[PDB]
């Protein structure tokens with residue numbers, strides 16, 4: 019439907035800037051495997067309710083597919099397919115031995131108890147075992163899922179497999195007690211910080227004391243601001259939640275901001291900070307802007323008023339292509355949406371390697387490897403940007419699709 023068709027259109031506009039055969043493009047349009055299963059569970063009242071589960075493996079040319087699991091009641095097969103297609107490019111732009119995967123269940127978990135959630139996870143694993151595995155398909159954290167759900171899923175997969183192989187490696191995002199890896203919580207934020215640092219280095223901007231404006235103050239936004247001020251030493255001037263936002267030229271420490279949000283339910287009315295809306299934060303003149311909220315915050319209506327030199331979009335496409343072009347012609351170095359939030363998938367890959375090899379790393383080693391991976395990926399995208407005279411998002415799409423197409427050619431899937 020709409021999401022899958024929009025993803026296909028994105029793939030088309032990406033391909034029309036690179037030399038790819040038509041048959042390979044057609045192969046990339048259609049995902050390899052779609053698995054729609056019935057997930058039966060018994061509720062606390064004793065009645066048996068069955069939900070609809072989707073597992074979409076878009077491609078596995080580069081390696082075993084990787085993909086998050088979303089227990090959203092509005093999840094659709096088209097949405098899962100589009101998300102798997104996006105995951106393919108997200109894992110390809112970072113040079114991981116992964117294909118694109120995605121999972122979901124049509125269910126609202128707000129009405130499910132802990133026992134019901136455990137039963138749902140266990141039954142979903144029982145249903146999708148034959149099309150997943152450590153070397154076939156790796157489920158991952160996503161919207162409305164917490165690491166305890168993945169703990170239950172890994173337990174069920176280990177029970178079914180009879181512990182023949184590396185069960186811990188079947189899924190990622192597991193609790194640190196069993197097969198977990200450090201830096202999982204700050205993964206996306208740390209990747210965003212590394213991308214911002216690389217963008218500043220490319221532009222020659224020294225970030226000591228510079229200005230960062232972050233829209234959306236979830237866990238990802240708070241970690242982004244905190245790690246920015248810690249490593250990059252930048253001055254946070256404005257942070258906003260889903261309700262409102264605050265502004266302070268002096269500098270905001272995210273610790274007390276998160277404390278205020280936890281106490282009063284929002285970051286509004288911060289001591290010494292002027293209360294402003296999302297639009298004022300977006301239009302605020304800063305050195306770098308980071309949208310970490312619900313997607314489609316920057317559109318062609320409000321693109322010409324953006325003044326930040328670097329835009330790092332953490333969310334899944336919060337800036338429209340028209341706004342992308344407007345920012346590009348304004349001399350603003352943007353960051354692709356799937357490139358910025360690729361820290362989470364990179365750290366999930368790290369955890370998968372830790373589980374597969376049976377050796378677990380420390381915070382420092384994971385951070386250094388993530389730094390290297392993000393630096394290399396961003397530099398590759400920037401080199402493609404400079405050479406092809408195209409957009410950052412288009413450059414990342416070209417890199418990802420070129421890698422996937424080369425993998426398909428090497429496997430013999432496509433002869434041209």
Ligand SMILES: NC(=O)c1ccc[n+]([C@@H]2O[C@H](COP(=O)([O-])OP(=O)(O)OC[C@H]3O[C@@H](n4cnc5c(N)ncnc54)[C@H](OP(=O)(O)O)[C@@H]3O)[C@@H](O)[C@H]2O)c1
Nearest residue numbers: 159160161162163164165166191192193194202203204237
């Ligand atoms: N996405 C992720 O990967 C992620 C994110 C955060 C944490 N974690 C992991 O999970 C652990 C933290 O636990 P959690 O995030 O699963 O949440 P949790 O500790 O399971 O939260 C307990 C639940 O009870 C409610 N609650 C909490 N305090 C309460 C109080 N004082 N009075 C009444 N109700 C209360 C909350 O409802 P409300 O939700 O309505 O407040 C919450 O959903 C951490 O160790 C971390 O590693 C993972």
